[PDB]
Amino acid sequence: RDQITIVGSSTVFPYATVVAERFGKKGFKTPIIESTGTGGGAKLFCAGVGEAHPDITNASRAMKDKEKALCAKNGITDIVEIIIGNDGITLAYSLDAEPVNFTKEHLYLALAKHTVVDGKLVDNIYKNWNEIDSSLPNKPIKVMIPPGTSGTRDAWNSLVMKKGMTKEAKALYKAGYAAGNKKYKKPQKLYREDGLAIEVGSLIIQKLVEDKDMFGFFGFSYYLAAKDKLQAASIDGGQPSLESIQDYSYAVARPLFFYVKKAHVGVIPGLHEFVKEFTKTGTIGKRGYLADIGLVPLDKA
Protein backbone atom coordinates (compact mmCIF):
# COMPACT_ATOMS: atom_id res chain seq x y z
CA ARG A 1 0.00 0.00 0.00
CA ASP A 2 1.28 3.39 -0.98
CA GLN A 3 -1.59 5.54 0.24
CA ILE A 4 -2.12 6.62 3.84
CA THR A 5 -5.44 5.51 5.35
CA ILE A 6 -7.19 7.70 7.95
CA VAL A 7 -10.47 7.03 9.75
CA GLY A 8 -12.32 8.51 12.69
CA SER A 9 -13.73 11.80 13.98
CA SER A 10 -16.08 13.82 11.78
CA THR A 11 -15.03 16.85 13.82
CA VAL A 12 -11.38 16.38 12.80
CA PHE A 13 -12.27 15.20 9.23
CA PRO A 14 -12.34 18.66 7.54
CA TYR A 15 -8.95 19.49 9.03
CA ALA A 16 -7.19 16.25 8.11
CA THR A 17 -8.74 16.59 4.64
CA VAL A 18 -7.07 19.97 4.03
CA VAL A 19 -3.73 18.64 5.29
CA ALA A 20 -4.13 15.60 3.03
CA GLU A 21 -4.98 17.72 -0.02
CA ARG A 22 -1.83 19.82 0.44
CA PHE A 23 0.24 16.71 1.17
CA GLY A 24 -0.86 15.12 -2.11
CA LYS A 25 1.05 17.85 -3.99
CA LYS A 26 4.40 17.17 -2.24
CA GLY A 27 5.54 13.92 -3.84
CA PHE A 28 3.18 11.50 -2.10
CA LYS A 29 -0.34 10.39 -3.04
CA THR A 30 -3.31 12.12 -1.38
CA PRO A 31 -4.20 10.14 1.78
CA ILE A 32 -7.57 8.39 2.01
CA ILE A 33 -9.79 9.76 4.78
CA GLU A 34 -13.10 8.41 6.07
CA SER A 35 -15.44 10.24 8.46
CA THR A 36 -16.47 7.36 10.68
CA GLY A 37 -16.81 8.88 14.06
CA THR A 38 -14.25 8.72 16.88
CA GLY A 39 -15.55 5.44 18.33
CA GLY A 40 -16.06 3.81 14.97
CA GLY A 41 -12.58 4.88 13.92
CA ALA A 42 -10.98 3.54 17.08
CA LYS A 43 -12.58 0.17 16.54
CA LEU A 44 -11.28 0.01 13.00
CA PHE A 45 -7.77 1.28 13.91
CA CYS A 46 -7.56 -1.22 16.74
CA ALA A 47 -8.79 -4.21 14.70
CA GLY A 48 -5.22 -5.29 13.89
CA VAL A 49 -1.66 -4.25 13.19
CA GLY A 50 -1.55 -5.14 9.56
CA GLU A 51 -1.48 -2.87 6.57
CA ALA A 52 -5.10 -3.82 5.84
CA HIS A 53 -5.98 -1.67 8.86
CA PRO A 54 -5.93 2.14 9.21
CA ASP A 55 -2.71 4.07 9.74
CA ILE A 56 -4.44 6.90 11.64
CA THR A 57 -7.69 7.45 13.51
CA ASN A 58 -8.93 10.99 14.19
CA ALA A 59 -10.56 11.59 17.56
CA SER A 60 -12.59 14.40 19.14
CA ARG A 61 -11.91 13.00 22.62
CA ALA A 62 -8.96 11.08 24.05
CA MET A 63 -8.69 7.38 23.27
CA LYS A 64 -10.64 5.34 25.83
CA ASP A 65 -9.28 2.63 28.12
CA LYS A 66 -11.53 0.07 26.42
CA GLU A 67 -10.07 1.15 23.07
CA LYS A 68 -6.45 0.96 24.21
CA ALA A 69 -7.26 -2.50 25.55
CA LEU A 70 -8.61 -3.67 22.17
CA CYS A 71 -5.54 -2.31 20.37
CA ALA A 72 -3.23 -4.02 22.81
CA LYS A 73 -5.10 -7.26 22.37
CA ASN A 74 -4.72 -7.03 18.60
CA GLY A 75 -1.02 -6.21 18.99
CA ILE A 76 -1.04 -2.42 18.76
CA THR A 77 0.77 -0.95 21.75
CA ASP A 78 2.81 1.63 19.90
CA ILE A 79 0.49 4.53 19.35
CA VAL A 80 1.41 8.15 19.01
CA GLU A 81 -1.11 10.67 20.20
CA ILE A 82 -1.07 14.01 18.42
CA ILE A 83 -3.05 16.98 19.80
CA ILE A 84 -3.77 19.28 16.84
CA GLY A 85 -5.78 22.06 18.48
CA ASN A 86 -9.19 22.70 20.02
CA ASP A 87 -12.89 22.58 19.18
CA GLY A 88 -15.96 24.13 20.73
CA ILE A 89 -19.08 21.99 20.54
CA THR A 90 -21.66 24.40 19.16
CA LEU A 91 -25.39 24.05 19.81
CA ALA A 92 -26.61 25.73 16.63
CA TYR A 93 -30.05 26.65 15.30
CA SER A 94 -31.72 28.81 12.68
CA LEU A 95 -30.87 32.51 12.42
CA ASP A 96 -34.62 33.16 12.22
CA ALA A 97 -34.98 32.44 15.95
CA GLU A 98 -34.04 34.63 18.92
CA PRO A 99 -30.68 34.44 20.71
CA VAL A 100 -30.83 32.22 23.78
CA ASN A 101 -28.62 31.15 26.70
CA PHE A 102 -28.80 27.71 28.32
CA THR A 103 -26.92 26.70 31.46
CA LYS A 104 -25.45 23.24 31.62
CA GLU A 105 -28.27 22.19 33.96
CA HIS A 106 -30.88 23.48 31.52
CA LEU A 107 -29.30 21.31 28.82
CA TYR A 108 -29.12 18.29 31.10
CA LEU A 109 -32.79 18.61 32.13
CA ALA A 110 -34.02 18.85 28.53
CA LEU A 111 -31.97 15.96 27.26
CA ALA A 112 -31.97 13.56 30.13
CA LYS A 113 -33.57 10.20 30.20
CA HIS A 114 -35.17 11.07 33.55
CA THR A 115 -36.68 13.87 35.59
CA VAL A 116 -36.64 13.71 39.37
CA VAL A 117 -40.31 13.89 40.42
CA ASP A 118 -41.29 13.51 44.08
CA GLY A 119 -37.93 11.99 44.99
CA LYS A 120 -38.09 9.40 42.20
CA LEU A 121 -36.57 8.98 38.75
CA VAL A 122 -39.25 8.92 36.02
CA ASP A 123 -39.08 9.29 32.25
CA ASN A 124 -38.35 12.92 31.28
CA ILE A 125 -41.48 15.04 31.84
CA TYR A 126 -40.17 18.26 30.26
CA LYS A 127 -41.69 19.07 26.86
CA ASN A 128 -41.01 22.83 26.62
CA TRP A 129 -37.89 24.80 27.61
CA ASN A 130 -40.00 27.34 29.52
CA GLU A 131 -41.12 24.58 31.92
CA ILE A 132 -37.50 23.99 32.94
CA ASP A 133 -36.86 27.68 33.61
CA SER A 134 -39.42 30.46 33.17
CA SER A 135 -36.62 32.67 31.76
CA LEU A 136 -36.26 30.33 28.76
CA PRO A 137 -38.44 30.69 25.73
CA ASN A 138 -41.81 29.07 25.24
CA LYS A 139 -40.44 26.63 22.78
CA PRO A 140 -40.84 22.92 22.40
CA ILE A 141 -37.80 20.81 23.08
CA LYS A 142 -36.44 19.46 19.80
CA VAL A 143 -32.80 18.47 19.72
CA MET A 144 -30.82 16.43 17.26
CA ILE A 145 -28.10 14.64 19.21
CA PRO A 146 -24.86 13.22 17.88
CA PRO A 147 -24.38 9.52 17.17
CA GLY A 148 -23.99 7.24 20.17
CA THR A 149 -20.44 6.23 19.42
CA SER A 150 -19.28 9.70 18.34
CA GLY A 151 -16.63 11.60 20.21
CA THR A 152 -19.00 14.58 20.25
CA ARG A 153 -21.52 12.48 22.17
CA ASP A 154 -18.80 11.41 24.62
CA ALA A 155 -17.58 14.96 25.16
CA TRP A 156 -21.10 16.34 25.58
CA ASN A 157 -21.78 13.56 28.11
CA SER A 158 -18.63 14.54 30.03
CA LEU A 159 -18.71 18.33 29.72
CA VAL A 160 -22.46 18.99 29.77
CA MET A 161 -24.49 15.98 30.98
CA LYS A 162 -22.22 15.01 33.89
CA LYS A 163 -21.80 18.59 34.99
CA GLY A 164 -25.34 19.73 34.41
CA MET A 165 -26.65 16.76 36.31
CA THR A 166 -28.37 17.75 39.47
CA LYS A 167 -27.28 16.65 42.92
CA GLU A 168 -30.70 15.04 43.41
CA ALA A 169 -30.51 13.00 40.22
CA LYS A 170 -26.92 11.95 40.92
CA ALA A 171 -27.96 10.52 44.28
CA LEU A 172 -30.89 8.54 42.80
CA TYR A 173 -28.69 7.09 40.03
CA LYS A 174 -25.96 6.24 42.56
CA ALA A 175 -28.48 4.46 44.78
CA GLY A 176 -30.01 2.61 41.81
CA TYR A 177 -26.51 1.57 40.75
CA ALA A 178 -25.57 0.41 44.26
CA ALA A 179 -28.83 -1.58 44.24
CA GLY A 180 -27.70 -3.33 41.06
CA ASN A 181 -28.45 -1.27 37.94
CA LYS A 182 -25.15 -1.32 36.02
CA LYS A 183 -26.43 1.24 33.50
CA TYR A 184 -26.67 3.75 36.35
CA LYS A 185 -22.93 3.79 37.08
CA LYS A 186 -22.40 6.34 34.31
CA PRO A 187 -25.81 8.02 34.16
CA GLN A 188 -24.58 11.00 32.10
CA LYS A 189 -24.88 8.67 29.09
CA LEU A 190 -28.68 8.42 29.38
CA TYR A 191 -30.87 10.48 27.03
CA ARG A 192 -34.63 10.67 26.67
CA GLU A 193 -35.91 8.27 24.02
CA ASP A 194 -39.35 9.83 23.47
CA GLY A 195 -38.39 11.56 20.20
CA LEU A 196 -37.37 14.94 21.64
CA ALA A 197 -33.64 14.06 21.60
CA ILE A 198 -33.48 12.23 18.27
CA GLU A 199 -30.15 10.67 17.19
CA VAL A 200 -28.72 12.29 14.03
CA GLY A 201 -26.88 9.74 12.01
CA SER A 202 -25.36 19.06 5.37
CA LEU A 203 -28.89 17.95 6.05
CA ILE A 204 -28.61 18.82 9.75
CA ILE A 205 -28.41 22.43 8.62
CA GLN A 206 -31.40 21.91 6.38
CA LYS A 207 -33.46 20.32 9.14
CA LEU A 208 -32.56 23.24 11.42
CA VAL A 209 -33.63 25.70 8.73
CA GLU A 210 -36.91 23.79 8.34
CA ASP A 211 -37.70 24.01 12.07
CA LYS A 212 -36.37 27.11 13.79
CA ASP A 213 -37.24 25.69 17.19
CA MET A 214 -34.84 22.76 16.66
CA PHE A 215 -31.28 22.69 17.89
CA GLY A 216 -28.32 20.69 16.67
CA PHE A 217 -24.67 19.89 17.38
CA PHE A 218 -21.77 21.19 15.39
CA GLY A 219 -18.05 21.16 15.54
CA PHE A 220 -16.96 24.82 15.39
CA SER A 221 -15.63 24.70 11.81
CA TYR A 222 -18.98 23.45 10.58
CA TYR A 223 -20.86 26.19 12.47
CA LEU A 224 -18.60 28.92 11.11
CA ALA A 225 -19.19 27.72 7.55
CA ALA A 226 -22.92 27.86 8.24
CA LYS A 227 -23.16 31.28 9.90
CA ASP A 228 -25.15 32.63 6.94
CA LYS A 229 -27.91 30.25 8.10
CA LEU A 230 -27.27 29.39 11.78
CA GLN A 231 -26.51 30.99 15.12
CA ALA A 232 -25.15 29.49 18.35
CA ALA A 233 -26.93 29.17 21.67
CA SER A 234 -25.00 30.71 24.49
CA ILE A 235 -23.95 28.10 27.03
CA ASP A 236 -23.27 29.25 30.61
CA GLY A 237 -23.42 32.81 29.25
CA GLY A 238 -20.82 32.31 26.59
CA GLN A 239 -20.67 32.05 22.85
CA PRO A 240 -18.23 29.87 21.01
CA SER A 241 -15.32 31.88 19.59
CA LEU A 242 -11.67 31.54 18.76
CA GLU A 243 -10.82 33.38 21.95
CA SER A 244 -13.27 31.66 24.27
CA ILE A 245 -12.40 28.21 22.94
CA GLN A 246 -8.66 28.94 23.07
CA ASP A 247 -8.59 29.97 26.74
CA TYR A 248 -11.32 27.42 27.60
CA SER A 249 -13.70 30.01 29.02
CA TYR A 250 -16.20 28.49 26.58
CA ALA A 251 -17.97 25.79 28.52
CA VAL A 252 -17.74 23.16 25.83
CA ALA A 253 -14.19 23.75 24.64
CA ARG A 254 -12.37 20.49 23.94
CA PRO A 255 -9.12 19.19 22.40
CA LEU A 256 -8.86 17.37 19.06
CA PHE A 257 -6.50 14.46 18.39
CA PHE A 258 -5.34 11.86 15.99
CA TYR A 259 -3.56 8.60 16.75
CA VAL A 260 -0.74 7.12 14.67
CA LYS A 261 -0.01 3.41 14.41
CA LYS A 262 3.79 3.46 14.79
CA ALA A 263 4.17 0.00 13.35
CA HIS A 264 3.05 1.39 10.00
CA VAL A 265 5.89 3.92 9.90
CA GLY A 266 8.48 2.34 7.64
CA VAL A 267 5.76 0.26 5.92
CA ILE A 268 3.41 2.89 4.43
CA PRO A 269 5.40 5.53 2.49
CA GLY A 270 4.90 9.11 3.61
CA LEU A 271 3.16 8.30 6.91
CA HIS A 272 5.77 10.03 9.14
CA GLU A 273 6.12 12.84 6.66
CA PHE A 274 2.36 13.40 6.80
CA VAL A 275 2.46 13.62 10.61
CA LYS A 276 5.25 16.18 10.55
CA GLU A 277 3.36 18.18 7.96
CA PHE A 278 0.22 18.22 10.12
CA THR A 279 2.25 19.28 13.16
CA LYS A 280 4.04 22.20 11.50
CA THR A 281 3.46 25.64 13.02
CA GLY A 282 2.26 26.84 9.62
CA THR A 283 -0.38 24.09 9.68
CA ILE A 284 -1.80 23.95 13.24
CA GLY A 285 -0.32 27.08 14.79
CA LYS A 286 -1.64 30.59 14.99
CA ARG A 287 -2.53 31.88 11.52
CA GLY A 288 -1.85 28.39 10.16
CA TYR A 289 -3.91 27.21 7.23
CA LEU A 290 -6.07 25.07 9.50
CA ALA A 291 -6.84 28.09 11.69
CA ASP A 292 -8.10 29.79 8.53
CA ILE A 293 -10.92 27.21 8.32
CA GLY A 294 -11.82 27.22 12.03
CA LEU A 295 -9.23 25.21 14.01
CA VAL A 296 -8.58 26.90 17.35
CA PRO A 297 -4.81 26.49 17.88
CA LEU A 298 -3.29 25.37 21.13
CA ASP A 299 -2.53 28.28 23.43
CA LYS A 300 1.24 28.69 23.71
CA ALA A 301 1.35 31.42 26.40
Numbering used by the authors: 24 to 224, 228 to 327
The authors write:
It consists of two domains, an N-terminal domain (NTD) and a C-terminal domain (CTD), linked by a hinge region. The phosphate molecule is bound in the cleft between the two domains. Although no additional phosphate was added during the protein purification, crystallization, and data collection process, clear phosphate densities were observed in the resolved structure. These residues collectively form 11 hydrogen bonds with the phosphate molecule, anchoring it securely in the cleft between the NTD and the CTD of CpPstS. It was observed that CpPstS has a significantly larger substrate-binding cavity compared to the structures of C. perfringens PstS, M. tuberculosis PstS-1, E. coli PstS, and other PstS from different bacteria.
Here, we investigated the phosphate transport system in Candidatus Pelagibacter sp. The high-affinity Pst system was initially characterized in Escherichia coli, Streptomyces lividans, and Bacillus subtilis. This system consists of four proteins: the phosphate-specific binding protein PstS, the membrane integral proteins PstC and PstA to form a membrane channel, and an ATP-hydrolyzing protein PstB to energize phosphate transport. Microscale thermophoresis binding assays demonstrated that CpPstS binds phosphate with high affinity, exhibiting a dissociation constant (Kd) of 112 nM.
